[PDB]
Amino acid sequence: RPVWFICSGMGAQWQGMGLSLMRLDRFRDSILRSDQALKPLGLRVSDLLLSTDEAVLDDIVSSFVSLTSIQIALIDLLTSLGLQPDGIIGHSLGEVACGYADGCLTQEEAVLSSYWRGYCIKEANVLPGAMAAVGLSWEECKQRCPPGIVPACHNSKDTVTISGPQAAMSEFLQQLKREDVFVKEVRTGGIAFHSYFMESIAPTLLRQLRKVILDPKPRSKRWLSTSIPEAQWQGSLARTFSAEYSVNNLVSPVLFQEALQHVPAHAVVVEIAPHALLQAVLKRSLESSCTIIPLMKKDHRDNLEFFLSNVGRLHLAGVSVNPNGLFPPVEFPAPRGTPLISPHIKWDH
């Protein structure tokens, strides 16, 4: 089976993000290295995770940093299991983390990217936006959307996230529920990402991310972009994780379903995110023959159990993962009087 890393984006946050997983050394130790990049800017991600409150789930600069810094740590645990990806797909702000997993992005360049991507947006005081996942074909959207309400995310073959004017959402959903349409709102801290709203920011962001990303590294064919049409994958822009790319990702539509297309048929898809947002979408928009696995469940009593639960599932899937890489090495030789094994290896006799 191939392994496919999927990196869920915005709306995927919640008070208490991987406070349980802080225990695990491989995790914490990576979240600390994220502080090391965020220190010259006077910011500590580990505090953002633990002084967490409503306002910081809504603060867009805390979020881009929180999500990315966690995703980057989840990815690290996955690499301790000894599980590298066959395919990679990002979904919005996730792509950043992806470019880490493909190895075009340093943990630092990755973290600081998210940080600025989020900063420049906040400081543009952009007008009250708001997104929602709504269940209609991408073309059904272009037909039935109030003016000024873009279709922004192509998730499934019949699930799309429209982006736009905060007040024009509220009264265009009061209006959709009343016809039984899939509608779950995404928490965006008020900003319409992946719409025309973003062009205003593009200049100042591009001009600044150019100082974080010198120099840009080549992307590998292992990583399918969802920010650039499959058409122009052999292009100049598409070829490298450059500032120019990071900025484009924030401005253009996320072509998710498009990438899901390329996902093989006995594939195992892991959602790498502080919360399994795209579970609905992936299961809907992919073969029944593919197993889909969360890594953390929001508001769970103890993510550390829920992650091991799923590390376990990644095994039942058939993938090659080994938990001993999460916890400190064992001191071989084993103690004397440590339970026999052969008598418990039962066969099909």
Side-chain angles (χ1 to χ4, degrees):
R1 318 186 59 161
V3 267
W4 281 79
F5 281 33
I6 291 311
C7 295
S8 277
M10 170 72 57
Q13 327 126 338
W14 63 272
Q15 286 184 62
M17 266 161 24
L19 280 188
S20 286
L21 291 150
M22 213 70 55
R23 312 207 216 117
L24 256 177
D25 270 337
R26 304 306 177 282
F27 189 75
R28 185 181 80 219
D29 274 34
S30 158
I31 264 195
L32 292 182
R33 195 158 31 240
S34 298
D35 283 344
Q36 225 35 225
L38 274 192
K39 177 165 126 206
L41 295 186
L43 210 79
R44 184 175 266 84
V45 204
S46 45
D47 280 343
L48 291 198
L49 289 197
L50 155 73
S51 301
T52 290
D53 70 15
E54 199 90 72
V56 96
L57 279 164
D58 287 328
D59 188 352
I60 165 192
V61 171
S62 303
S63 279
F64 284 47
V65 161
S66 275
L67 264 71
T68 277
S69 267
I70 275 174
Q71 301 185 113
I72 279 181
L74 289 172
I75 286 177
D76 277 347
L77 293 190
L78 291 187
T79 336
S80 348
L81 300 193
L83 189 177
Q84 274 190 329
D86 294 322
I88 302 181
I89 284 166
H91 181 285
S92 165
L93 156 79
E95 294 233 287
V96 181
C98 288
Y100 174 43
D102 185 58
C104 336
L105 257 198
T106 336
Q107 178 167 357
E108 17 279 1
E109 296 184 338
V111 176
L112 291 161
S113 289
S114 274
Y115 177 90
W116 292 121
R117 292 173 30 94
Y119 181 77
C120 309
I121 288 200
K122 184 181 79 199
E123 280 226 3
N125 280 105
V126 39
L127 256 148
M131 319 174 85
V134 171
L136 313 157
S137 67
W138 178 263
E139 276 286 319
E140 276 176 343
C141 296
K142 289 213 155 166
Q143 294 261 131
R144 193 191 188 172
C145 268
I149 291 195
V150 156
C153 302
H154 199 253
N155 296 160
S156 79
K157 314 186 189 181
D158 70 27
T159 295
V160 149
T161 320
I162 44 172
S163 179
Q166 150 168 313
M169 245 41 178
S170 218
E171 267 231 315
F172 177 53
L173 306 177
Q174 279 172 27
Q175 145 73 12
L176 272 208
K177 307 282 191 170
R178 295 157 138 191
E179 330 150 356
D180 210 5
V181 210
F182 188 1
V183 153
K184 189 156 211 167
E185 319 156 45
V186 353
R187 161 198 246 93
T188 21
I191 295 218
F193 307 112
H194 309 294
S195 79
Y196 57 76
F197 261 93
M198 303 290 88
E199 308 271 17
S200 329
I201 310 196
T204 82
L205 181 58
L206 167 73
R207 161 181 130 149
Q208 147 78 181
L209 277 178
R210 277 168 169 168
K211 308 159 174 204
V212 210
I213 309 187
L214 39 122
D215 324 329
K217 295 75 173 193
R219 305 160 70 255
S220 96
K221 308 198 162 190
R222 271 157 50 244
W223 177 24
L224 310 199
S225 182
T226 74
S227 56
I228 297 172
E230 203 222 359
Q232 313 146 323
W233 278 12
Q234 255 53 9
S236 298
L237 165 55
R239 208 182 31 85
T240 65
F241 212 132
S242 62
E244 291 83 348
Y245 180 137
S246 193
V247 182
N248 177 187
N249 168 259
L250 269 188
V251 185
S252 288
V254 271
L255 324 169
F256 203 36
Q257 210 270 98
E258 286 75 12
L260 284 187
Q261 209 49 22
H262 282 91
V263 153
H266 297 312
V268 188
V269 171
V270 293
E271 189 172 345
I272 287 196
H275 178 51
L277 280 196
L278 304 188
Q279 291 275 307
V281 186
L282 289 157
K283 281 163 184 179
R284 209 177 309 200
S285 200
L286 210 35
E287 253 93 18
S288 49
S289 31
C290 284
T291 309
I292 280 150
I293 301 192
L295 280 195
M296 282 168 44
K297 170 185 167 198
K298 112 172 189 179
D299 294 326
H300 196 269
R301 164 183 53 98
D302 190 359
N303 283 308
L304 172 67
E305 284 176 26
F306 185 100
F307 169 89
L308 287 164
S309 260
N310 293 343
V311 164
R313 300 216 202 209
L314 270 187
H315 185 68
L316 297 207
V319 192
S320 277
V321 304
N322 188 339
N324 302 335
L326 304 182
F327 319 85
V330 199
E331 55 185 58
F332 299 113
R336 155 218 154 263
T338 195
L340 294 152
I341 279 199
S342 78
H344 309 299
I345 294 174
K346 318 230 169 189
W347 318 63
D348 193 337
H349 274 191

PDB file of all heavy atoms in Angstrom, residues 322-342:
ATOM      1  N   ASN A 322       6.592   1.216  13.836  1.00  0.00           N
ATOM      2  CA  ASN A 322       7.132   0.630  15.058  1.00  0.00           C
ATOM      3  C   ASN A 322       7.232   1.598  16.238  1.00  0.00           C
ATOM      4  O   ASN A 322       8.151   2.411  16.286  1.00  0.00           O
ATOM      5  CB  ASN A 322       8.504   0.035  14.774  1.00  0.00           C
ATOM      6  CG  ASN A 322       9.034  -0.756  15.939  1.00  0.00           C
ATOM      7  OD1 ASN A 322       8.601  -0.568  17.078  1.00  0.00           O
ATOM      8  ND2 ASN A 322       9.973  -1.653  15.666  1.00  0.00           N
ATOM      9  N   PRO A 323       6.298   1.486  17.202  1.00  0.00           N
ATOM     10  CA  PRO A 323       6.099   2.368  18.363  1.00  0.00           C
ATOM     11  C   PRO A 323       7.322   2.588  19.238  1.00  0.00           C
ATOM     12  O   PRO A 323       7.400   3.601  19.931  1.00  0.00           O
ATOM     13  CB  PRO A 323       5.017   1.645  19.169  1.00  0.00           C
ATOM     14  CG  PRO A 323       4.237   0.956  18.155  1.00  0.00           C
ATOM     15  CD  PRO A 323       5.236   0.475  17.126  1.00  0.00           C
ATOM     16  N   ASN A 324       8.263   1.661  19.228  1.00  0.00           N
ATOM     17  CA  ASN A 324       9.439   1.827  20.072  1.00  0.00           C
ATOM     18  C   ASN A 324      10.265   3.106  19.761  1.00  0.00           C
ATOM     19  O   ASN A 324      11.175   3.479  20.515  1.00  0.00           O
ATOM     20  CB  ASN A 324      10.293   0.552  20.032  1.00  0.00           C
ATOM     21  CG  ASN A 324       9.517  -0.679  20.482  1.00  0.00           C
ATOM     22  OD1 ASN A 324       8.546  -0.570  21.232  1.00  0.00           O
ATOM     23  ND2 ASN A 324       9.945  -1.852  20.026  1.00  0.00           N
ATOM     24  N   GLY A 325       9.932   3.779  18.661  1.00  0.00           N
ATOM     25  CA  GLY A 325      10.629   4.994  18.280  1.00  0.00           C
ATOM     26  C   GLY A 325      10.019   6.237  18.898  1.00  0.00           C
ATOM     27  O   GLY A 325      10.536   7.341  18.748  1.00  0.00           O
ATOM     28  N   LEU A 326       8.902   6.059  19.590  1.00  0.00           N
ATOM     29  CA  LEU A 326       8.248   7.165  20.251  1.00  0.00           C
ATOM     30  C   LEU A 326       8.873   7.343  21.615  1.00  0.00           C
ATOM     31  O   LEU A 326       9.117   8.469  22.044  1.00  0.00           O
ATOM     32  CB  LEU A 326       6.765   6.882  20.414  1.00  0.00           C
ATOM     33  CG  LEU A 326       6.046   6.579  19.113  1.00  0.00           C
ATOM     34  CD1 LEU A 326       4.560   6.364  19.385  1.00  0.00           C
ATOM     35  CD2 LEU A 326       6.296   7.703  18.111  1.00  0.00           C
ATOM     36  N   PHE A 327       9.135   6.230  22.301  1.00  0.00           N
ATOM     37  CA  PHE A 327       9.658   6.271  23.669  1.00  0.00           C
ATOM     38  C   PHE A 327      11.132   5.875  23.712  1.00  0.00           C
ATOM     39  O   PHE A 327      11.613   5.199  22.801  1.00  0.00           O
ATOM     40  CB  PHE A 327       8.843   5.355  24.578  1.00  0.00           C
ATOM     41  CG  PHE A 327       7.375   5.412  24.324  1.00  0.00           C
ATOM     42  CD1 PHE A 327       6.804   4.637  23.333  1.00  0.00           C
ATOM     43  CD2 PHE A 327       6.567   6.247  25.061  1.00  0.00           C
ATOM     44  CE1 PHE A 327       5.448   4.688  23.088  1.00  0.00           C
ATOM     45  CE2 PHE A 327       5.208   6.308  24.824  1.00  0.00           C
ATOM     46  CZ  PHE A 327       4.647   5.525  23.834  1.00  0.00           C
ATOM     47  N   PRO A 328      11.853   6.292  24.775  1.00  0.00           N
ATOM     48  CA  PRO A 328      13.298   6.058  24.899  1.00  0.00           C
ATOM     49  C   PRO A 328      13.697   4.601  24.649  1.00  0.00           C
ATOM     50  O   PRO A 328      12.959   3.708  25.022  1.00  0.00           O
ATOM     51  CB  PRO A 328      13.587   6.467  26.349  1.00  0.00           C
ATOM     52  CG  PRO A 328      12.580   7.534  26.637  1.00  0.00           C
ATOM     53  CD  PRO A 328      11.333   7.081  25.908  1.00  0.00           C
ATOM     54  N   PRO A 329      14.854   4.361  24.018  1.00  0.00           N
ATOM     55  CA  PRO A 329      15.309   3.009  23.697  1.00  0.00           C
ATOM     56  C   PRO A 329      15.355   2.097  24.917  1.00  0.00           C
ATOM     57  O   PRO A 329      15.585   2.575  26.023  1.00  0.00           O
ATOM     58  CB  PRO A 329      16.739   3.246  23.192  1.00  0.00           C
ATOM     59  CG  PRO A 329      17.132   4.514  23.840  1.00  0.00           C
ATOM     60  CD  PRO A 329      15.894   5.338  23.682  1.00  0.00           C
ATOM     61  N   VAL A 330      15.161   0.798  24.701  1.00  0.00           N
ATOM     62  CA  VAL A 330      15.184  -0.186  25.778  1.00  0.00           C
ATOM     63  C   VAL A 330      16.588  -0.729  25.961  1.00  0.00           C
ATOM     64  O   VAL A 330      17.349  -0.827  24.995  1.00  0.00           O
ATOM     65  CB  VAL A 330      14.252  -1.361  25.477  1.00  0.00           C
ATOM     66  CG1 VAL A 330      13.923  -2.126  26.762  1.00  0.00           C
ATOM     67  CG2 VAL A 330      12.989  -0.860  24.785  1.00  0.00           C
ATOM     68  N   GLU A 331      16.934  -1.084  27.196  1.00  0.00           N
ATOM     69  CA  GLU A 331      18.295  -1.507  27.475  1.00  0.00           C
ATOM     70  C   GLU A 331      18.464  -3.002  27.268  1.00  0.00           C
ATOM     71  O   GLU A 331      18.302  -3.798  28.189  1.00  0.00           O
ATOM     72  CB  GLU A 331      18.753  -1.057  28.865  1.00  0.00           C
ATOM     73  CG  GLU A 331      17.860  -1.498  30.015  1.00  0.00           C
ATOM     74  CD  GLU A 331      18.302  -0.912  31.354  1.00  0.00           C
ATOM     75  OE1 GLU A 331      18.361   0.336  31.472  1.00  0.00           O
ATOM     76  OE2 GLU A 331      18.581  -1.701  32.291  1.00  0.00           O
ATOM     77  N   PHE A 332      18.775  -3.363  26.028  1.00  0.00           N
ATOM     78  CA  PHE A 332      19.051  -4.741  25.663  1.00  0.00           C
ATOM     79  C   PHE A 332      20.442  -5.024  26.181  1.00  0.00           C
ATOM     80  O   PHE A 332      21.325  -4.190  25.988  1.00  0.00           O
ATOM     81  CB  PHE A 332      19.026  -4.928  24.129  1.00  0.00           C
ATOM     82  CG  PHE A 332      17.690  -4.615  23.479  1.00  0.00           C
ATOM     83  CD1 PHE A 332      17.559  -3.520  22.632  1.00  0.00           C
ATOM     84  CD2 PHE A 332      16.573  -5.413  23.712  1.00  0.00           C
ATOM     85  CE1 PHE A 332      16.332  -3.219  22.028  1.00  0.00           C
ATOM     86  CE2 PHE A 332      15.349  -5.122  23.120  1.00  0.00           C
ATOM     87  CZ  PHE A 332      15.227  -4.025  22.275  1.00  0.00           C
ATOM     88  N   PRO A 333      20.665  -6.209  26.803  1.00  0.00           N
ATOM     89  CA  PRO A 333      19.773  -7.364  26.992  1.00  0.00           C
ATOM     90  C   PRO A 333      18.616  -7.177  27.966  1.00  0.00           C
ATOM     91  O   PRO A 333      18.710  -6.422  28.939  1.00  0.00           O
ATOM     92  CB  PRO A 333      20.718  -8.457  27.518  1.00  0.00           C
ATOM     93  CG  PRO A 333      22.049  -8.064  27.051  1.00  0.00           C
ATOM     94  CD  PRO A 333      22.046  -6.565  27.165  1.00  0.00           C
ATOM     95  N   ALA A 334      17.533  -7.894  27.680  1.00  0.00           N
ATOM     96  CA  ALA A 334      16.334  -7.899  28.496  1.00  0.00           C
ATOM     97  C   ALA A 334      16.590  -8.546  29.846  1.00  0.00           C
ATOM     98  O   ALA A 334      17.429  -9.435  29.962  1.00  0.00           O
ATOM     99  CB  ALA A 334      15.231  -8.635  27.772  1.00  0.00           C
ATOM    100  N   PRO A 335      15.856  -8.106  30.875  1.00  0.00           N
ATOM    101  CA  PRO A 335      16.025  -8.639  32.224  1.00  0.00           C
ATOM    102  C   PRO A 335      15.792 -10.139  32.237  1.00  0.00           C
ATOM    103  O   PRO A 335      15.045 -10.626  31.390  1.00  0.00           O
ATOM    104  CB  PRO A 335      14.921  -7.928  33.010  1.00  0.00           C
ATOM    105  CG  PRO A 335      14.637  -6.693  32.247  1.00  0.00           C
ATOM    106  CD  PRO A 335      14.806  -7.081  30.824  1.00  0.00           C
ATOM    107  N   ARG A 336      16.428 -10.848  33.169  1.00  0.00           N
ATOM    108  CA  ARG A 336      16.198 -12.281  33.351  1.00  0.00           C
ATOM    109  C   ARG A 336      14.857 -12.513  34.038  1.00  0.00           C
ATOM    110  O   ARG A 336      14.515 -11.818  34.993  1.00  0.00           O
ATOM    111  CB  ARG A 336      17.313 -12.906  34.184  1.00  0.00           C
ATOM    112  CG  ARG A 336      16.882 -14.164  34.920  1.00  0.00           C
ATOM    113  CD  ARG A 336      17.504 -14.266  36.315  1.00  0.00           C
ATOM    114  NE  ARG A 336      16.670 -15.065  37.221  1.00  0.00           N
ATOM    115  CZ  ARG A 336      15.793 -14.551  38.084  1.00  0.00           C
ATOM    116  NH1 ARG A 336      15.636 -13.231  38.180  1.00  0.00           N
ATOM    117  NH2 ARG A 336      15.074 -15.359  38.857  1.00  0.00           N
ATOM    118  N   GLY A 337      14.107 -13.498  33.551  1.00  0.00           N
ATOM    119  CA  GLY A 337      12.775 -13.771  34.068  1.00  0.00           C
ATOM    120  C   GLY A 337      11.750 -12.899  33.377  1.00  0.00           C
ATOM    121  O   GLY A 337      10.681 -12.600  33.912  1.00  0.00           O
ATOM    122  N   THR A 338      12.100 -12.469  32.176  1.00  0.00           N
ATOM    123  CA  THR A 338      11.210 -11.660  31.372  1.00  0.00           C
ATOM    124  C   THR A 338      10.480 -12.649  30.459  1.00  0.00           C
ATOM    125  O   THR A 338      11.115 -13.412  29.739  1.00  0.00           O
ATOM    126  CB  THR A 338      12.014 -10.565  30.612  1.00  0.00           C
ATOM    127  OG1 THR A 338      11.138  -9.556  30.090  1.00  0.00           O
ATOM    128  CG2 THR A 338      12.851 -11.178  29.494  1.00  0.00           C
ATOM    129  N   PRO A 339       9.139 -12.658  30.529  1.00  0.00           N
ATOM    130  CA  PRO A 339       8.224 -13.678  29.993  1.00  0.00           C
ATOM    131  C   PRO A 339       8.613 -14.325  28.650  1.00  0.00           C
ATOM    132  O   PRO A 339       9.001 -13.634  27.704  1.00  0.00           O
ATOM    133  CB  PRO A 339       6.909 -12.906  29.849  1.00  0.00           C
ATOM    134  CG  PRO A 339       6.953 -11.906  30.932  1.00  0.00           C
ATOM    135  CD  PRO A 339       8.402 -11.518  31.105  1.00  0.00           C
ATOM    136  N   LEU A 340       8.479 -15.647  28.568  1.00  0.00           N
ATOM    137  CA  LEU A 340       8.758 -16.367  27.336  1.00  0.00           C
ATOM    138  C   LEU A 340       7.884 -15.843  26.230  1.00  0.00           C
ATOM    139  O   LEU A 340       6.869 -15.206  26.481  1.00  0.00           O
ATOM    140  CB  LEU A 340       8.471 -17.846  27.512  1.00  0.00           C
ATOM    141  CG  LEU A 340       9.386 -18.573  28.489  1.00  0.00           C
ATOM    142  CD1 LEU A 340       8.657 -19.754  29.101  1.00  0.00           C
ATOM    143  CD2 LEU A 340      10.665 -18.996  27.788  1.00  0.00           C
ATOM    144  N   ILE A 341       8.270 -16.145  24.997  1.00  0.00           N
ATOM    145  CA  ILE A 341       7.508 -15.714  23.824  1.00  0.00           C
ATOM    146  C   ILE A 341       7.029 -16.876  22.942  1.00  0.00           C
ATOM    147  O   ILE A 341       5.856 -16.930  22.579  1.00  0.00           O
ATOM    148  CB  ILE A 341       8.291 -14.672  22.980  1.00  0.00           C
ATOM    149  CG1 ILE A 341       8.145 -13.284  23.611  1.00  0.00           C
ATOM    150  CG2 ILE A 341       7.827 -14.675  21.519  1.00  0.00           C
ATOM    151  CD1 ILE A 341       8.456 -12.161  22.670  1.00  0.00           C
ATOM    152  N   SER A 342       7.914 -17.819  22.634  1.00  0.00           N
ATOM    153  CA  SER A 342       7.563 -18.902  21.717  1.00  0.00           C
ATOM    154  C   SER A 342       6.218 -19.590  22.004  1.00  0.00           C
ATOM    155  O   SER A 342       5.506 -19.963  21.075  1.00  0.00           O
ATOM    156  CB  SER A 342       8.697 -19.927  21.625  1.00  0.00           C
ATOM    157  OG  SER A 342       8.706 -20.781  22.750  1.00  0.00           O
TER     158      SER A 342
END
